Amino acid sequence: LAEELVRAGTHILCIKDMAGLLKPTACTMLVSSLRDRFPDLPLHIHTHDTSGAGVAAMLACAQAGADVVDVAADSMSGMTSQPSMGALVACTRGTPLDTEVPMERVFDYSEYWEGARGLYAAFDCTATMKSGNSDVYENEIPGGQYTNLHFQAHSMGLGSKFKEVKKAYVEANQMLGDLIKV
Amino acid sequence: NRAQKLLHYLGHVMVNGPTTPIPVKASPSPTDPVVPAVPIGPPPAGFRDILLREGPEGFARAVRNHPGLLLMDTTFRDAHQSLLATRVRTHDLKKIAPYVAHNFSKLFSMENWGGATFDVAMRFLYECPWRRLQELRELIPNIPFQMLLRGANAVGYTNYPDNVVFKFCEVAKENGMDVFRVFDSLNYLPNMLLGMEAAGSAGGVVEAAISYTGDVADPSRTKYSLQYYMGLAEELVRAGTHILCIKDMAGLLKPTACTMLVSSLRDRFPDLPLHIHTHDTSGAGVAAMLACAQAGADVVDVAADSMSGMTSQPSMGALVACTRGTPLDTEVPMERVFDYSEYWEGARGLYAAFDCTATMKSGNSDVYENEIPGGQYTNLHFQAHSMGLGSKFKEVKKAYVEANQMLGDLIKVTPSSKIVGDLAQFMVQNGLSRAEAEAQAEELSFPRSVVEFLQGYIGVPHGGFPEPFRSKVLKDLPRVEGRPGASLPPLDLQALEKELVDRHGEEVTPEDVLSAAMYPDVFAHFKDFTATFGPLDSLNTRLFLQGPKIAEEFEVELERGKTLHIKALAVSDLNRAGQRQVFFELNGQLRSILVKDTQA
Known part of the structure; x- marks a missing residue:
C-alpha cells in the first residue's frame, strides 16, 4: 500500500485508525518499517x-x-475521543520530542470546554455513557459512529442491553468479509 | 417486631x-444490573494461599520472582471514593464478589478500606x-485484602x-x-x-x-529528591518491611522520571x-504506567473500565490488552474484563443523584499544580457546586495552593488535605486576601x-x-x-467501655468501642438510628434511597428466618397538625402505621 501511495505522489502519508486499535510494539515496528525507506x-x-490506552500507543x-x-481538548478527551492533550504536552519534559508548550494554555482551554459542555447536556453522551470501554478490539466500532449508536438505544430505552447489537455486528461484517469499516 | x-x-x-443529604436532585433510572454467571465450584487459587503457606518473606520473594507483572484491584475502595461520595452499599459488592473470585485469580491483592471511608x-x-x-x-478465601492504614492515627483525624x-x-x-x-x-x-511494629506484633505482612510529590526529573525541584527518597527507603528497610510501595494519590507520575526512579531503586535493591x-x-496513567x-x-x-478515566486508577482492560507482544504478558481472559466493566457500568447508574460524572465530565489536568487527591478533589468540586457553583470552584483551587504553600511545601494526604481545604475555606468564605491577612496572623481565630496542626x-x-x-497563631497555648x-x-479502654455499656446496655463490641473512641457523637447517632429502625442493609439501593413508589411490587429478604413480600397501597391525609398515615398490605394481612410529618 505504501509503495503505490508513494508512487501516486502523496505529499504526506498518514496512518488512519477509527477504532483506536494501536498497540505500542505494533506501532513502533510498523513506523520503523515505514521510516526505513522514506527518510x-x-x-x-x-x-x-x-x-x-490511546496515549501509550501515541507515545x-x-x-x-x-x-x-x-489530539483533542483536555476536558473533551477520554472516553472515546483523542488522548488528553495535557498529558501529551506534559509527558515530554526531557524526552527529545520537545513540545515546549505551556501547561496554562491547556488548562484554560480545558476549563473553557468543561464549562461549555454543560450547555449540550440534553443530548450529551456523558449523561448516557460514563467512561470509554475496551469493547473495541472485538467490535472495532469507529469512534464517531459509536457514540450515537449506543446513545439512541440507551436514551430511547430498551437498548440498554446493547450486547446483542455488538453480538450481531461482528458477523454482519463477516458476511461481507473482514472489511475496512469507516 | 422487626419489620x-x-x-x-x-x-x-x-x-x-x-433523609440523607443529596447534593443535586435527580431520579435514579429503574434499571437492574445483571451479573454474568460463574461456575459453582471453588474459585481458582490465588495469592492468599501462597501467603498462608509460604509466609510473608517467602510471599514477597515469590512476588519478586514471578516471571511477569502482577495486578492488584482497588475498585472496591478508591473507585467510588474518587467518583462517588463512597456511598456504595455492601449489597452492591455482594453481587460481584463471586465473579471476581472465580475469574480474577492471579490478582495480587484487593483494597477495600480507605481514609474517607470509615468516618x-x-x-x-x-x-x-x-x-x-x-x-x-x-x-473471598482466594485473594488477600488491603486497607489504607495511617501510622499514628488509626482511621480518624487525631493521634491515639x-x-x-x-x-x-x-x-x-x-x-x-x-x-x-x-x-x-x-x-x-x-x-x-x-505502624510497622504493630503489624509485626500482629504477625501479618508489613507493607510501608x-x-x-513533585517531579524528580526537574533539577529545580530537589528539596525532596531521589537521594532523599532512597534514604527514606534505607531507613524503612532497616526498620524492616516485606514490601515497599510508592503511592501517588494525585497521579503525578510521568513515564521516564518514574522509570529512572524504578531503575535507581531496583539496582540497589534487586x-x-x-x-x-x-x-x-x-x-497519562496507562502510558507512563506501562x-x-x-x-x-x-x-x-488498576480500576474497572466503567470507573476508569476521570480521577480513578488505570483501566485494567487497557493494561491487559496493550501487553500482548511482550514477555511480561498479563495472561487475563479479556471477555471477563468486558463483563466486569459492563456490570459496573450498569451499577454506576444507581447513584445517579450524586456523582462526579454529573458534576464534571471526563477528568482534567491542573492536578500538576493542585496535586489534590481524587476523592477529596471530587468532594470539594461537588460541594463547591452545591453551596456555590462551578464558577466558584475556580478560586478555591488557586486558594488551595496558597493554603498549602503558606504551611510549607508539605505532602497533602487525607489529614493534611482536609487541613489545607479547611484553611482554604476560611480563606474564601472569610472574604480576606493574602498580604493583609498574613501580615498580621496573630489575631485571626x-x-x-x-490550631490542632x-x-x-x-x-x-x-x-x-x-x-x-x-x-503568631498559637500565642499562649x-x-x-x-x-x-x-x-x-x-x-483506658475499660473506662469508656463501662461508660457505654451502662449508657446503651450490654450490646457492646470492641469494634464499636473503637468507633465511639474516634467520635462518640456520630456513634450515638448511629446507635439511636439502629434502636429506632432496627436491622438494615438487606434493602436495595433504590429501596434505601428512594424506596417504593406508589403501587409497585418488590421483595425484601431481611433474615434467613422468614421471607416477606411488600406491596404499596395508599397514603392517608394529614390530621393532627401534620401527622400523616399510610396503609400497606403484607402477605396475608394488612398493616397500618402512623408517621409524624416534619413540617409541624
Missing part, C-alpha cells in the same frame, strides 16, 4: 482513545519516528 | 422525602464497616495511644485479613515505625509506603518487591483543626513548622512536641 516523507498518526508512535499526531 | 421498624422508616422516607460510613451513611469486612472476607492502635491492627489481622498498607500524611518516621499506586486524573512497570516491578494498581498534635513535619506563623502518640495522655 524525507513525513508521517501522520490519528487514533481514538476509546479503549483507554510509542511518536518515539518510533512520527512527526504529526492528532 | 415494623422497617415499615416506620419507609413510611417516613416517603412522607418526608430523602462517612456513619456520618452521612448508616453502615458498619466491620461487618462489611466480616462478610467480604468469608466470601499506642495500645489502642496496636489492638486495632491485631483485631484487623485476626478478623481474617492478611496485609496492611502503612503510611502517614507526612513522612514522619516514628509514625511508620509504630512512601508518598510521592530482591526488594515493589508496588505502585496512581490515579488517572492526569490523563513504561514504568517495564523495569523491575512486581504489582500494579483559625478553626479547631488548624499548628499545635503539633497530629505531628511535626519533616521540613518543620513555620516559626513566624506558629508563634500548650504545645505538644516529640511524638504526641506517647506525649499525649493515653486513655
